[model samples]
Target: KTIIINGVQFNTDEDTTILKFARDNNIDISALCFLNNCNNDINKCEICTVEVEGTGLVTACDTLIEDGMIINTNSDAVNEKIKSRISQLLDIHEFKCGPCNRRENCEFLKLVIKYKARASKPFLPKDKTEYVDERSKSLTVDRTKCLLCGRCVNACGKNTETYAMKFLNKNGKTIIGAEDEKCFDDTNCLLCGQCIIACPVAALSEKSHMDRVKNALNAPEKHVIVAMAPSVRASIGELFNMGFGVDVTGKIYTALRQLGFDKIFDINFGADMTIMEEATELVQRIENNGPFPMFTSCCPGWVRQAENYYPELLNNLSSAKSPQQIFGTASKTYYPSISGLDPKNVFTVTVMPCTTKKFEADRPQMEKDGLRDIDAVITTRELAKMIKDAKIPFAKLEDSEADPAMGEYSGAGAIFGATGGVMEAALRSAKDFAENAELEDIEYKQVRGLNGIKEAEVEINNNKYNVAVINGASNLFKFMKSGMINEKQYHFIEVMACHGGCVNGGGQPHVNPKDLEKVDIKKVRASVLYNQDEHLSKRKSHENTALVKMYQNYFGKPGEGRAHEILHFKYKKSAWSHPQ
Candidate 1:
C-alpha cells in the first residue's frame, strides 16, 4: 500500500495505526490519551487529530492507515481541533504551574506551549480540598489537574488487570476514581502507582513522604540512616539529564550525605540479607517435602494483590521482609548495637522505585515494640526532586561509596530490581545449600527478561523441581485464573507486580511517551543491574562478607533463631473489601 503523509509518499503493507506509522517515518504527532499501546476509547483528548482526504479529521492514534490514503498531520483543521480540546481541558484544569509536581517534563504543558493554547475561562478554585484525594498511603489524586483523558484508567486496567482505577459518574459529572469513590486502600487496588506513570500531568502522584524525611533530618538527636533500592541507581539519573540506564549509585550516596544523612547505606545489602533467609527457607521447605510452591514476598504490590484477591495463597508466601523493610529493621537494631547508638534515636529512611513500598513500610506488622522498621519511604522521583530542590549538581558530583558497614552487597543482590532476579538469586544459594557445595554455575537465564509469565525446571540435589516467574500483576491474574498453577508442581515462584520488575516500577522516573518509544526503558535500566552483577567478585548472597558477619556476630543462622525472629514477616488473608 502506498500512502501520502504530508506530501511524502510511503509504501507499506504492514497494518498499523496512522500515529504509529507517522512515528516510524519520523513524523511528529502529539499524543496525550494514548499510552502503552492503548488509547482512551471512552473519552479521548484528540490531541493526535489529523486530516485525511475525503474523510474528516480523526484521531491518528486509533485510525488505521489505508492504501492511497492522503494524510495531513499539521493541517489548520487538525491544529484547531487539537487546540480546541486543549482549551477545553484548560478551562477545567488548575493552571498554577509554579508549584505543580509535574511542572518539569509534563506532556500536557509541552503540548500547550507547542500550540500556544489559552483557556476561554481559567479554572482557579479558591479551595481545592474537595478536588484532592490523599487518603491512600501510596497514591494521591488532584481532580483540578485531571484532564479526564482516562490514561490512568487505561493504565490500571492494562498493567494490573484489576481495574482498581475506574471512570465514575460523581455528582452528575464524569470523573476517574477508585471503585465506588472509596479510598484506594479500602478497595482491591494494588496501589502500584501505575496510574501515576500513565498520567500525562500531575493529576496523579505518589503521596509525599518529603516532610517525614525532612523532619527526621532536622531532629538534633536523631541518627538518620538513608538507604536506596537497587533500581534507583539505574533510573534516577534520567531526572538529572544523565539519561537512562546510567549507574549513579555512588553519586546518590554522596548526595544523601550532602542532604544531612548521618549514614548512607545501600538496600542491595538488605537484598542479600533477604536472599540468605529466603534461600534457607526454600531449602527447609524442600527437605520437608510438602507445602510446595513458596512464593516471593518481596513485592508489596503482589502482597496486596494476594490479600485482596488471592487470600488462599497467603500461606504460600515466603516469610521474608522486603529489602527495604529488612534494611530498616537492621538499621535500628544491628547498626545501633554495633555503633553504640541508641535504637530509639535511629531514624530509618528508604528511597525506593516503588510507591506500594510506602504502604508496606507503614504496615503495623512491620513494626516491633512500637518502632516501625522504616520511618519513611520516598520514591525515586521524590529523591530527584529533593536533590534538585537543594540545588545539588547531581551530574557534576564525584562518585562516593556507601558506608561499608551495611553497604557491601553481592552480585545476586544487585540484580533484584529486575524480574526473576530473586528466583535466580535464591536458586544460586538454594542449590549450594541443598548440595552443600560451592557451585560454579550461578546464572539462571531461563527466567530472565520482561515476559509476562515465565517458567523453568531446575535440579537441586539431582531432583527436578519446577519454578515460575510472574512478571506483572495482570500476568499473576492470568496465571492463577487460567488454572496454570494446577498444571505443574511448582516448588518456588517469583512474582513482581510491576512488569519488568522494579526497574519499571510505578514510582521510578516517568519517561515521556517519546522517550519511552525511543528506548527500551525496562531492558536498558535492567542492564545496569545485570552489568553490575557480572563484574562483582561476590556473586552469591551467602558470600557477602558484611552480611555474613552480621549473621555470625549478631543474628546467628539464616532461617532460624534471632535471624528469623527479626527478619521474617508473614501475611494473612483478608475479607473481600473491593466493590463487587
Candidate 2:
C-alpha cells in the first residue's frame, strides 16, 4: 500500500504506473502529456513529473512504484519543476493562444490555474508565433498552440487509422503538421473531428460559429429555426456537471427557448425519415441482388473516407441523407408547406455532435432546388456555451417536449446516437419490408456494445443475411486492407468514423482519458439511448405515426418515386492525389 497521499491508503495495483495509482486514489498528480494508449506513440509532453520518495523528481507516467514507496505529488520542489516544466512545455506552443477550448474540462488549464504559471518571461526559447493553418474549414489548426505532444497525429494516424495527420518539419524536436506536408484542404483528411477532440489545446479545434449563431439569433430579416441531433441531448448535459448518459432533452428544449430560437425541433424526425429511406433501400438491394453490402450513410466522416480511400465502395453507401441533412431538406420543403412561411425566410441551423456536420452541410451536392440543406452547423460544445450565455437556471428548468411537426420521434430513432443503434434500428424496420407482418422481437442483441467491430447473422422472411458493424476507421481500414470488404462477406455493414459512434464523435465533450477509469462515457451515453428505446412507445422507424402523415402527404411511400429526389444522394468517386 502506498502511504496516505492525504491520510488515505491506496492499495494500488502493482501493475499500474504511479500516475494511474494516484488517479485511482483521488490524488492530484498533474501530468498533461500522459496519454493512456499507444506504445512508441505521442509521449513528448511529460508534465506529470512528481517528487519521488527520496529518489528526487521523475515522471510518474511510465515509472513503477517500489514497496512502501512514499511520494509527494505537490512538493515545493515538485511544484517548482511543474511550473518550469509547463513554461518549457509551452515553448513550442502558441504562446499567444489564449482561452481554453475545453474550459473546465481542460487538464492543461487546470495545472496552469493551480501553478499560476507564466511562460518563461525573459527566458528565450522559440517565439511560438510561426504558423497558423486555418485551411480546414471544419476544424482549425494553430501550429503554435501545439505542445508537439502528437496526440492529434496519433489519434488520426493510429487510433482512427486515417493517417491524414503526422509530425513534419522538426525544430531539432518533433513538429505537429499534416502528413506529407499536404495543404490541410488537399490532404485525404476525412474530417471526422477526432483530431479536434484528441488535442489538449487549441492546436486543434472545431471552427467557431458562436458569432454566426449570435448574429442569426439577432437578425430581424430572417425567421431562423434550430434543430438538434439525437446524440446531442444525450451529451450536452455533461457540460453542466451532469454525468455522461444523462438525457437532457427536456432541459435543452427549455434552454433553446431562452436562447431565442423561433422554433426548436428534434432531428430524430430526420432519423425516422432516414430509417424509412435506408431500411427500404437495404431490403430492395437484398431482394434485387443489387450491391452486396449496403453501408450506412448517417456518418459524413465515414462517407468522406469512402470518397477518398475506397472508390469502388461508393455504390455501397446508402443513398439516404444523414438525419441532419434530412431535417434540413424537410424543414425547407415540407415545413414551409404547412407553416405558411417562404423557405427563403426560414433560415435553418443544425446542432450536431459530429465535426463533419459542418463539412457535410456545406457540400455543394447536398442542396435541393435553390436552398442549401442547412445554413449552419454547431457542435454540441458550442450549444452548451450558448445555454450558459443565456443564463437559464439549470436545476429549476421544467421538462419540456420538442415542438410539433418535426419534433416527434420513435424509439428506433432515439438509439441512433449509440453504436450498433443504426444497425438495430434498421433490423427493426427491415422485417416489415421482408414480410408484411411484424416480428415478436425488436431487440437485436448481437450487434450491441463497444466492440470495435460487431457481427451477426439473421433470417428475415426466410432469407439469411450477414451483417457487420464497425465503429472506428482503424478496424474498418484493417478489414478494407484485408480485402474482406472487396470480397463482400456481409450483405449489410454499418461504419462510423469515431470509435463507438456519433456519441463519441470528435465534436462531443472531452472526457480526459485518464479520468475514464471513473466513467465509461460511451457506456453512459449508450445506456441513455437504450433506456430511451425501452420506454418509448414507437420502437420501429416505420411505426412512426407522424411520418405516416408525410408518407401519405409528401414522399408517397419509402422507395416509391419522389422520396429519392428529396431524401437520397449519389456518392461519386473523387480524385485523391494520395495513394492507398
Candidate 3:
C-alpha cells in the first residue's frame, strides 16, 4: 500500500494512522497525549492533527488510512489547530506551574508552555481539592492531577480477563475515578501499576519510601544491605541521560555504595536461585502428571494476579519464591551467618524494576525468622531519585562489582528482566537436569519478544516439553477463555503482568515520547540483558558457581531441607476476590 505523507510517497500498511506512518518513515509529526507507555488510546485531545487532501483535518490517533491517501502532518493550519487544543486542555486544568520534576521530559507541560497555551490569568479546575486514593498499599492517585487523558483507563482496560479499573461515572462531567466507596484492592485488582507509566503527570504513583530510606541511612545502628534486580541495570541509566539499555551494572553498584550502603548484592543471584527451584518444581510436576502446566511464579505481579483473580489454579503455580523474595530472605539468614552480623541488624533493601515488589515484600508469607524478608522495596525510578538526591553523578560513576556468595550469577539469571527470559532460563537449566550433561545452544530464541502470548515445544535429549510465555495480566484471561492453558497443552508457563516484562516494569523511568519512535525502549532494554547473557561464560542456571557454592555450603540443594524453608511459598486467594 503506497501512501503520500508530507508529499513523500512510501509503501505503508493501510491499517495504521498518519502519525505512525510519519513516525515509521522518520517524519517529525509532533504530538502530546502519545506517551510511549501507551500506543493506541484515542485522541480526545488534538495535539496530533494533520490535514488530508480532501478532508479539512483529522486526528492521527483515531483516524485510519487508505491505500491512496495524502496526509500533511504539519501544515500551518494544523499547527495552529494543535496550539488551540493545548489551550483548551490548559483552560480546563489547574497547576502551580513552576519547575516540574519532569523538567524537559514532561509531555503535557511541554505543549502547554511551548505554544503559550496557558490562559492570560491563572486558571481554576472543578476538582481543585486533591484527593488521595487510599484503597491499596501499592499505589495512590490524586484525582486533581488527572487531565482526563484516559491513558490510565486504557492501560487498565475493561476486558473480561482484565479485572480492575474503569472510567468511573462521567454522568455528565469529565471522567474522574472510582467512587469514594471503594479503593483499588476492593475489586479483584492486581496492583501492577503499569498505569504509572501511562500517566504523563505523576497523578498516579507508588507509595514512596524515600524518607524512610533517608532515615535508615541516618540511623547509626542499622546495617544496610542493598541488592539490585537485573532489569534495573539496563533501565536505571535512562534516568541519568544515558542511552536506553546502556549497561550500568557497575555504575549502579558504585552509586549504591556511594550512598553509604554497608553492602551491595545482585538480585540476579536470587534469579539463579529462583531458576534452580523453579526448574525442579516444573520437572517434578511433569513427572507426576497431575498439574501438567506448571506456571513460573517469579513475577510478583503475576503471582498477585493469580491470587486475586485465578485462585482455583493456585496449585499449578511454582512454590519457589520470586527472586526478590529469595534475595530478601537470604540477606537475613545466609548472608548474616557468614558475615558475622545479627540478622536483626541487617536492614535489607531490594532495588527492583517493579512496583508490585512492594506488595510482594509486604506479604505475610514472605516474612521469615519472625521478621520481614525485605525491609524495603524500592523501584528503579525511586532508586534513581535517591541517587539524584544524594548528589551522586550517576553517569560519571566507574565500574564496580558486588560482594561474594549471593553477588555473582549465571547468564540465565541476567535475562530474567525480559519477557520469555524465565522460560528460556528454566529450559536451559531443566535440560541439564533431564539430560545429566553439560549443554550448549542454551538460548531459546523462539520464546523471546514483546508479544502478549507465545508458546513453543522445546526438546531435551529426545524428550519434548510444551512451554508458553505470557505477558500482561489481561492476556491471562484470554488464554484461559481460549482454553490454551489446559494441562495437556502446556507443561510450563511464564507469566509477567507488565507488557514486556520487568525491563518495561511499572517502575522503570518513562522514555521521552520523541525517542520512543526511534528506539523500541522495551527491545533495547531487553537486548542489553541478552547481551549480558551472551558475554557471560556460564549461561545456564544450575552451573552458577556462586549459587552452587551457596547450596553446597549452606542450604544443601534446590529443594527440601533448609533451602525449602527459605525458597518456597504457597499462594492464597486475595481477600478482595471473595468479598464478604
Candidate 4:
C-alpha cells in the first residue's frame, strides 16, 4: 500500500502503522509513547492523535496505513490537538522547578516549552505525593514525579528482561514500585540503572556524592586532584548545551582548573598503563595455562555484578585494575613522588561515567602505602553540575592541557570507555609486543559501536586469538551463561555494565527513554572518542611515551613485583564488603 505523508510517498506494508510509515518516509510527526515495534496505547496519553481521511481522530501509532491513504501530518488542526494533549498531560502532574534533574533536556519539558503550557484547569495529583522505595543500594524511586509514561516498565521488561519493577494501581493513582517490595539486592534485578535512564523526571536518581565532592574541594589543607574517564571527554559537553559528541578534553581540564582542582589529569594515561599490564597478564596466563577466556576488568559495574551473580567466573576476570583504579594507584605513588608532595596530603578525585566505579574506588584492596588510592569519586553528571554551579562557561572556555607527567595518553587509551575498547586496545599492544607490527587502521571497527555481544578472531605471530565483547550486565549474563557451558569459542572477553558501553553509563547522563528512542546516543557520544583518536599524534598504547618512559626509568617491566603491587588487585566474592 502507498501512503502520502507531508507530500512524501511511502510504500507501506499491511502491518505497518501510520507513525512507522510516516517516519520511514521522512515525515515529521510528533510522538511520545510510540517506540519502534512496541505497543502504543494512545488512550493513556493522546499525544499521538492524528486526523485520518475518514476517521475524525485516530492515533498514528495504532492506525494502520492503507492504499491511497493521504495523511496531513503537518496540518494546523493536528498540531493544535497535539499541543492541547501535551498541555493536558503536563497539568495533571506537579513538574515544578524544585528537585527535577530533567529540568532542561526532558522531552516532556521541551514539549511544554514548545506548546507554552502554563497551567492545568483541573489539577489531579495522586493522593499520596511522596513514596520513597530504596530497594536498590545505588538508587531510589520516588513515585510523586512519575509521569505514568510506562517507559521504565517497558525498558526493564523488553531491554533487560529483568521484570523487577512494574506500574502499580490504575489511572490517576498509578505509581512505580517493586513487584513485592523485595530489595533490588535480593531480587533478580540486574541493577543496570536503565530504569533510571528511562525515567523522564527525578522519579529515579542515584545516591549522589555531590556533597562529598564539594566538601573535599573546599578543604583548605587538602590538594584535590581531578581525573576524568576517557569517555567523559566525549559526552560531557552535551549537558552544557554544546553539540553532541563535542570533544571536551581541553574544556574539561580548563573547567576543573576554574573549579579549583589542584591538578587535572587524564584517565587515558592510566588506560595506556592498563593495556601494558592486562596484555602482559593475558600472555602470562596463556603461557602458564592458568585461566582460559581472561576478561577485561576495565568496567567496575561488570566486575561487581559478576561477583554478585556469577562468582565462579571470578578467575576469568583479569587481575589488572581498571583505568580509574590504576590512575588512583599511580596518583598515590608516582604522582606524589614526581610532584614532590606528600601522598597523604593529596586527595585523588575520579570523574567517571559509571556509578559502579564509586563501588570500585572504595574496594578493600584499592589502598596502598596506608593511603586510600582514590579519595573521592564523581560521576560525569556530577562533574557537569559542578562546572555549571561554578558558573564556568564550558563551551566558551579556552582549551587547557593536562599535567604532562600523569596526563599524556594515546588513541588506544581514549577508546577505553566504549565496549570493545579495552579488547581492541589490548590487541594493539599485544600485536606490537608479539609481532613488532604497528597498527595501520587503528579503528578496529570490528569491536566498535553498541552491540549486545561481539566476537572476532585475529591472527598474529602465527597464532589465532579469539576475542568477544559484551556490553550491559544483562547481555554479559547471556554471553557468560552460553560460553561457560561451551568454552571453545573465545580466549578473551570485554564486559561493560551499562548498555552502549560507558558512553551510556549509569553515571553519564539522565536521558529520558522518550528522547533515547529518537536519539542515537551511543553514536553521538562515541564520535567524540573516535575523533580524539584520529587527531592524536600517537595511536597505540604501547607507543605512549610516558608509559614507555615510566617502564624504562622506574617500574622496569610490566609484571614486576613493584608494578604488580601498585597496578593489580584481587576481587572479593561480595560487593557489600567495600564501602563505596
Instruction: Say which candidate scores most in TM-score.
Output: 1
Which digits, one per residue and each the tens of the lDDT, describe model 4 over residues 497-523?
Answer: 777788888777865444565779888
Q: What's the CA error at residue 91 for candidate 4, in Å?
A: 6.0
Candidate 1 segments exceeding 4 Å error: 574-580
Estimate the Cα RMSD of every predicted model relative to the unseen true structure: 1.6, 3.4, 3.4, 4.4
Of 1 and 2, the candidate ranking higher by lDDT: 1
lDDT of 1 by residue, 65-94 (tens): 999899999989889999999999999999
lDDT of 3 by residue, 1-580 (tens): 8788888988855477677767767887766665533443543667778898898788776677787788887788988898877776666555654533455366778677777676544555555444557556677776655677777766666222453655655555555454432676555667788777777875777867666677787789888888998899999888888877699999999999999988888899999999999887776676676476788888877876777667876888888989988888888888877889888888888898887788888887678778678888888888998898789999998889998677898999999999999899999988888777788678788999988889898886687878899977778878877777764578888998887788888788987667775789889999989999999988888888988987888889786778887779977554554355
Residues 234-258 of candidate 2 have per-residue lDDT tens digits of 8888888877778888888888888
Per-model TM values vs. the true structure: 0.98, 0.90, 0.89, 0.85
In terms of lDDT, model 4 sits at: 0.76
lDDT of 2 at 46: 53
Instruction: Please list all clashing residue pairs in model 1, or write none if there are none.
Output: none
Against the correct fold, how does model 3 do in TM-score? 0.89
lDDT of each: 0.93, 0.79, 0.79, 0.76
